[PDB]
Amino acid sequence: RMILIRGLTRVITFDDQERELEDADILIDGPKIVAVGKNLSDRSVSRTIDGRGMIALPGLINSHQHLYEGAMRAIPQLERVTMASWLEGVLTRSAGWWRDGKFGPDVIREVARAVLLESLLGGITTVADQHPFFPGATADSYIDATIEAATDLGIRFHAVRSSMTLGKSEGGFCDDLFVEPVDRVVQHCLGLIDQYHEPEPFGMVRIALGPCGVPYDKPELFEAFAQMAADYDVRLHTHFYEPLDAGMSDHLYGMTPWRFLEKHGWASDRVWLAHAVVPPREEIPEFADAGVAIAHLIAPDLRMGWGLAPIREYLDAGITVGFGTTGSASNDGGNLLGDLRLAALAHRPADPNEPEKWLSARELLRMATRGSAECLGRPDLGVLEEGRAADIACWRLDGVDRVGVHDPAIGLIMTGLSDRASLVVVNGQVLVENERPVLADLERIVANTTALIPK
Amino acid sequence: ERMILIRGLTRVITFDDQERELEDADILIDGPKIVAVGKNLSDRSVSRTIDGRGMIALPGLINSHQHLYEGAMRAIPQLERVTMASWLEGVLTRSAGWWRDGKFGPDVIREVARAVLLESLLGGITTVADQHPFFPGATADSYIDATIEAATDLGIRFHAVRSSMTLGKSEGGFCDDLFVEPVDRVVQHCLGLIDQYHEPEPFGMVRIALGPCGVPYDKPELFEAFAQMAADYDVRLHTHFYEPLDAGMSDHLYGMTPWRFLEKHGWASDRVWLAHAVVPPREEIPEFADAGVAIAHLIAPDLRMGWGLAPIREYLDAGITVGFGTTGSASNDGGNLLGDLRLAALAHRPADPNEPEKWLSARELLRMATRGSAECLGRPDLGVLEEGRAADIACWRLDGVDRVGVHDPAIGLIMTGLSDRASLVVVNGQVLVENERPVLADLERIVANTTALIPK
Ligand SMILES: [Zn+2]
Ligand SMILES: [Zn+2]
Numbered sequence: 001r002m003i004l005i006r007g008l009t010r011v012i013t014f015d016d017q018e019r020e021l022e023d024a025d026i027l028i029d030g031p032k033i034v035a036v037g038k039n040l041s042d043r044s045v046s047r048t049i050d051g052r053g054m055i056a057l058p059g060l061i062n063s064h065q066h067l068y069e070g071a072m073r074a075i076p077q078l079e080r081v082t083m084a085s086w087l088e089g090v091l092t093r094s095a096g097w098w099r100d101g102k103f104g105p106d107v108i109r110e111v112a113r114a115v116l117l118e119s120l121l122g123g124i125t126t127v128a129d130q131h132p133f134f135p136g137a138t139a140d141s142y143i144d145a146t147i148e149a150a151t152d153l154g155i156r157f158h159a160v161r162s163s164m165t166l167g168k169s170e171g172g173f174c175d176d177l178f179v180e181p182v183d184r185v186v187q188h189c190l191g192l193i194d195q196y197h198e199p200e201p202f203g204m205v206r207i208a209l210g211p212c213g214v215p216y217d218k219p220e221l222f223e224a225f226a227q228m229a230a231d232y233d234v235r236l237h238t239h240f241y242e243p244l245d246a247g248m249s250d251h252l253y254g255m256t257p258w259r260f261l262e263k264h265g266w267a268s269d270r271v272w273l274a275h276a277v278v279p280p281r282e283e284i285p286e287f288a289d290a291g292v293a294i295a296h297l298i299a300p301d302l303r304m305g306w307g308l309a310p311i312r313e314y315l316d317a318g319i320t321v322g323f324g325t326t327g328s329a330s331n332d333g334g335n336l337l338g339d340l341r342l343a344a345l346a347h348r349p350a351d352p353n354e355p356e357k358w359l360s361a362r363e364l365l366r367m368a369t370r371g372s373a374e375c376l377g378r379p380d381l382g383v384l385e386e387g388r389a390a391d392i393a394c395w396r397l398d399g400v401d402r403v404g405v406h407d408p409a410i411g412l413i414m415t416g417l418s419d420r421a422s423l424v425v426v427n428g429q430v431l432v433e434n435e436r437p438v439l440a441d442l443e444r445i446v447a448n449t450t451a452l453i454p455k
Numbered sequence: 456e457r458m459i460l461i462r463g464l465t466r467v468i469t470f471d472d473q474e475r476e477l478e479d480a481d482i483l484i485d486g487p488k489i490v491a492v493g494k495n496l497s498d499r500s501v502s503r504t505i506d507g508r509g510m511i512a513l514p515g516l517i518n519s520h521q522h523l524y525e526g527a528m529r530a531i532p533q534l535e536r537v538t539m540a541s542w543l544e545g546v547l548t549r550s551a552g553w554w555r556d557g558k559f560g561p562d563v564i565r566e567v568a569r570a571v572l573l574e575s576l577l578g579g580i581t582t583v584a585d586q587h588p589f590f591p592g593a594t595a596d597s598y599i600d601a602t603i604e605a606a607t608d609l610g611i612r613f614h615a616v617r618s619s620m621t622l623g624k625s626e627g628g629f630c631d632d633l634f635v636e637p638v639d640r641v642v643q644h645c646l647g648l649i650d651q652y653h654e655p656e657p658f659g660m661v662r663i664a665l666g667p668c669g670v671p672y673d674k675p676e677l678f679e680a681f682a683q684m685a686a687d688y689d690v691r692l693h694t695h696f697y698e699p700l701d702a703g704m705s706d707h708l709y710g711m712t713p714w715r716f717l718e719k720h721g722w723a724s725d726r727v728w729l730a731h732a733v734v735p736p737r738e739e740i741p742e743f744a745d746a747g748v749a750i751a752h753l754i755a756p757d758l759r760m761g762w763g764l765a766p767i768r769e770y771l772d773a774g775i776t777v778g779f780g781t782t783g784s785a786s787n788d789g790g791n792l793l794g795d796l797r798l799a800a801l802a803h804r805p806a807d808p809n810e811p812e813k814w815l816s817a818r819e820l821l822r823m824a825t826r827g828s829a830e831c832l833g834r835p836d837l838g839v840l841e842e843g844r845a846a847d848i849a850c851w852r853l854d855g856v857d858r859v860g861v862h863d864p865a866i867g868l869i870m871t872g873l874s875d876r877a878s879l880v881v882v883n884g885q886v887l888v889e890n891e892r893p894v895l896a897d898l899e900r901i902v903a904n905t906t907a908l909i910p911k
Contacts, residue, residue: 070859074866080804080811114859121857122873243808299801305814307805332870333857338794345758346802348536352699352761355536400902401577401789403526403570404909410530414788417578418874446856453860 001046003028003390003428008051009397010408011036013384014058014370018362020409026056028390031202031428036384049430053398054422055408057365058382059125059156059391060336061372063295064274066327067129067146068094068108068137070115071453073332083242083304090133090329093454095175098136102454109145114449116155117440118334120431123393123421128376130160130237132212133327135178137162138188147196147205153440154431156391158376159196160210160237161189165217171252173215182220186228193232201380202389204427206234208376213239214257215248219264226265235377236266240273240294243306246280258283267292272322272375277301277309284310284317293320293375296367298343300330308350311343312357322372323364337412337419340364344413361413394423457502459484459884464507465853466864467492469840470514470826474818476865482512484846487658487884492840505886509854510878511864513821514838515581515612515847517828518792519751520730522783523585523602524550524564526571527909529788539698539760543629546785551633554591558910565601570905572611573896574790576887579849579877581612584780584832586666586693588618591633595644603652603661609896610887612847614832615652616666616693617645621673627708628672638677642684649688657836658845660883664832666693670713671704675720682721691833692722696729696750699762702736714739723748728778728831732770733762740766740773749776749831752823754799756786764806767799768813778828779820793868793875796820800869817869850879 004027011021013036027034027045042048069090072078078089097103112129119127129146131137143159150157166172167179180188189209197207209225211217217238229236239245241257249257258279261267269291276294279287287294296311314321325331325339344364351357373382380389397408401418405411424432431438460483467477469492481496482489498504525546528534534545553559568585575583583606587598599615606613622628623635645665653663665681667673673694685692695701697713705713714735717723725747732750735743743750752767770777781787781795800820807813829838836845853864857874861867880888887895 072860072862073858074861074863074870076863076866079816079863079866080814082809082811085811111860114856118857118859118873302801302804305804305808305811307808328860328871332861332867333872335857335873338797338873342798342801345755345798348758348761349763352763353538355538355541355761358536358761360535398902398906400570400898400905401574401791402529403574403902403905404528404567404784405530405788406528407530407532407535410532410535411788414530414535415784415791416789417574417791417794417876420873442856446854446859449859450854 002034002044004040004042004045004048005051005056006048008054008056008394010055011384012055012057012365012409014366015383015385025051026384026392028425028428031389033384033386033388033390035386049423051394054394054396055412056384056392056394058369058384059393059424059426060123060368061126061322061376061382062119062124062324062334062336063128063272063322063372063375064297064324064326065115065127065129065334066131066133066329067112067115068131068134068142069327069329070111072329078329086304086330087133091135094134095136097454098140103136105141105145107452108142109149110449110452112146112149113153113445115328115334116150116153117437117442117445120153120155120424120437121421122335122337122419123395123424124336125391125393125424125426126156126158126376126378126381128158128160128208130162130210132162132164135164135175138180143192151205154426154429156204156426158206158208159192160208161192162210162212163217163221164212165221182218182224185221186224189228193234197234199233202427208235208237210237213245214260215245222261222264222266229270236271238273240276241279242275243278246278256280256283258286270377274324275301275309277306284313288317288319293322295322295324295372295375296343297324297326298346299339300326302342302346303330308347311347311359315363320371320374321367322375323367324372335419336368340368341413361410364413365409390425390428392425393421396422457500458490459886460496460498460501460504461507461512462504464510464512464850466511467840468511468513468821468865470822471839471841481507482840482848484881484884487845489840489842489844489846491842505879507850509852510850511853511868512840512848512850513579514825514840515849515880515882516579516792516824517582517778517832517838518575518580518780518790519584519728519778519828519831520753520780520782521571521583521585521790522587522785523568523571524587524589525783525785526567528785534785539700542760542786547630547634550589551591551631553910561597561601563908564598565605566905566908568602568605569609569901571784571790572606572609573893573898573901576609576611576880576893577877577891578791578793578875579851579880580792581847581849581880581882582614582832582837583611584614584616584664586616586618588620588668590619590636595636595640599648607661610882610885612660612882614662614664615648616664617641617648618666618668619673619677620668621677638674638680641677642680645684649690653690655689658883662690664691664693669695669701670716671701678717678720678722685726692727694722694729696732697735698731699734702734712736712739714742730780731757731765733757733765737769740769744773744775749778751778751780751828751831752799753780753782754802755795756782758798758802759786764803767803767815771819776827776830777823778831779823780828791875792824796824797869817866820869821865846881846884848881849877852878
């Protein structure tokens with residue numbers, strides 16, 4: 001009862017040798033890839049899928065979503081704002097809607113269902129969601145809602161439990177009722193691991209631990225989480241060197257955000273860090289030696305006016321770099337592949353006479369697959385080879401908008417009227433085919449969710 | 456012979472003199488022109504009513520700067536990360552090589568143009584201005600005739616800008632002289648093209664413009680001949696403008712800035728639109744305004760070649776007309792104008808991190824891609840959804856899963872979505888796209904035919 005994808009025009013593996021293949025196949029057994037190569041046997045195969053005219057990649061992995069923000073897209077007052085106005089805007093709406101019973105757990109479930117379905121249609125097979133800018137998150141069964149939506153759809157899912165534990169009063173940056181006692185956060189997290197965490201290879205739901213950041217959480221939370229990570233082999237995540245962070249840190253602790261993390265147990269290989277826009281250059285070698293990973297988030301970095309993270313420098317230092325979209329209040333889409341084009345182009349003017357420093361299409365596609373898998377600590381994902389999860393995303397190459405394309409991988413980044421995936425498989429299950437959801441009722445999900453968006 | 460009514464569009468963006476937008480409203484079409492825009496329009500003499508519910512309607516997008524033949528030069532590994540010098544050398548070498556091997560004649564260019572122009576319609580683009588500079592040999596071959604043939608077959612509105620490279624490296628230029636034509640040959644050819652193809656009347660479907668490659672690439676004698684020709688025949692003038700090394704090259708050759716050069720040779724006028732305009736001296740900007748020149752913003756190639764951000768806000772502040780374009784697919788590498796708008800919306804912001812009021816808005820960008828481009832091309836009949844203007848219309852569906860939770864649909868069109876494919880597209884009153892598919896063209900056959908002819 002295996003599945004064979006036959007005759008793929010191009011296969012990008014991102015294996016240890018960066019192999020690519022032409023007119024080749026992928027054989028799938030249950031949740032696992034059996035083989036990648038030419039003329040594989042359809043012996044034990046119960047189904048053969050025609051891959052001709054398609055390019056196949058590992059499933060894309062979005063290492064940074066804020067699903068609840070799907071209901072906050074294209075709001076005119078938030079179109080052109082800097083971080084302070086943006087943050088205030090999002091925090092007030094999530095707090096206001098919630099208090100008025102417009103943002104119940106069931107509203108978040110359906111918003112998550114739409115953004116995760118959009119994610120599948122964009123070739124994204126794993127999503128890591130966090131909720132730093134929705135205070136009522138825990139007081140309303142919000143991670144249970146998102147996990148319910150993800151499992152219904154069959155998308156692989158990492159739920160990052162976030163918080164803002166440093167109160168506006170005692171030095172913080174938060175309305176003193178988005179604040180939870182450290183032990184309360186810890187205990188909620190422990191319960192989530194018990195209930196949902198799937199640590200085995202090919203696990204479909206995992207829990208990670210994600211304070212909002214140095215300006216937002218108590219050092220006691222960072223240390224408690226560092227302990228939990230070792231205890232339960234889960235991952236640690238936080239925001240990192242956003243503009244102004246360095247000053248806020250120096251003010252609270254008289255040290256850099258990095259020095260702070262190192263002091264509280266987060267300078268380790270269990271850690272991935274969001275944005276990393278403006279670190280002191282002299283700290284980059286330390287990032288590398290500690291083995292932290294970094295998620296590049298081009299859309300919000302441009303949207304906020306933050307600018308260009310030193311990604312080339314990170315790769316030069318051998319640091320793991322993944323990719324993410326962040327929430328749809330700062331993007332405002334969940335289109336990861338589309339955002340790769342933004343990064344491909346926007347980094348270039350920074351080095352006008354040194355094109356060798358510009359990020360390539362292949363470097364970017366890697367970030368969105370293997371790089372993100374490494375950020376989430378998933379050695380079972382992000383690569384097309386025997387033994388890895390059968391998480392696969394394919395795009396058609398034969399459309400009128402891709403005529404004259406000479407290199408299909410570069411083509412995926414540099415051409416097209418549409419980033420819609422043709423064929424998407426997650427955990428060996430076909431979820432999208434011919435650009436359409438196989439199991440999900442698209443029109444009904446749109447109808448249901450739209451009715452629930454706070455008016 | 457009746458009219459067409461598009462009924463109940465969720466949102467209509469007119470870009471009229473008041474910047475009107477409507478909800479649950481209609482557009483009434485009669486032949487080539489819009490009869491009315493408003494709620495509950497009459498279907499008295501209507502032969503067909505189209506359901507516009509769930510769509511946003513805009514004036515058809517206008518791509519004021521294309522190089523169609525470059526559609527055959529997409530995603531070439533050797534050209535992925537290159538500066539202008541290497542890029543230009545690679546495009547010239549390849550086009551010259553293919554041409555001499557007999558693989559890049561007008562018949563091939565016709566089919567490459569057919570594909571890029573069909574892509575254009577599918578992306579909601581209703582008018583394209585193509586600047587073709589490639590005329591190898593001893594006589595100017597029928598490349599323009601070929602692009603016009605493709606455009607007319609498809610029914611897309613079309614401006615053919617006859618380009619050239621008349622300054623050989625021997626006299627300070629960049630090209631293997633196989634590309635260099637005598638100025639008289641270019642001028643003679645342009646006269647014939649105007650006579651044969653130009654449709655100066657309102658709603659004209661084919662027009663001719665005159666477009667040297669630029670100050671570093673063409674003789675001053677050509678600019679002057681074209682200024683005379685533009686005046687005598689009432690056509691427009693187009694060239695590349697203030698790309699990064701341009702100021703130094705013009706200083707070396709002429710001892711004057713690119714703008715002073717254009718001024719001297721008859722191009723500081725309201726007949727002119729200018730591509731890129733990345734790095735002008737700030738002091739010259741008020742002069743652009745007083746001369747009445749228009750500027751086409753081309754974000755994708757400006758970024759792709761590492762040039763950076765044109766001072767678009769400054770142009771708008773000065774009241775200079777600003778349109779939008781994609782340039783050719785060797786430096787984009789798509790023909791997706793709507794998608795390029797998101798690039799501009801986001802990429803300009805980090806240049807003014809503390810003054811978000813300076814950032815280009817979604818509505819300013821959509822204006823550039825419609826009315827701004829119309830004005831670059833000298834088309835008061837295009838770019839606006841109102842009575843008396845051409846029935847060129849582009850509509851997108853707002854009810855897809857990837858646009859759930861969108862609060863403002865104009866912003867949504869730029870900032871969200873998995874696809875830029877237009878739902879319904881009308882050109883010159885003819886419905887050419889419906890349900891994201893061509894209604895008169897055979898999509899699959901065109902893809903197959905053109906693919907077969909791409910030089911490999
Ligand atoms: Zn975030
Ligand atoms: Zn050009």
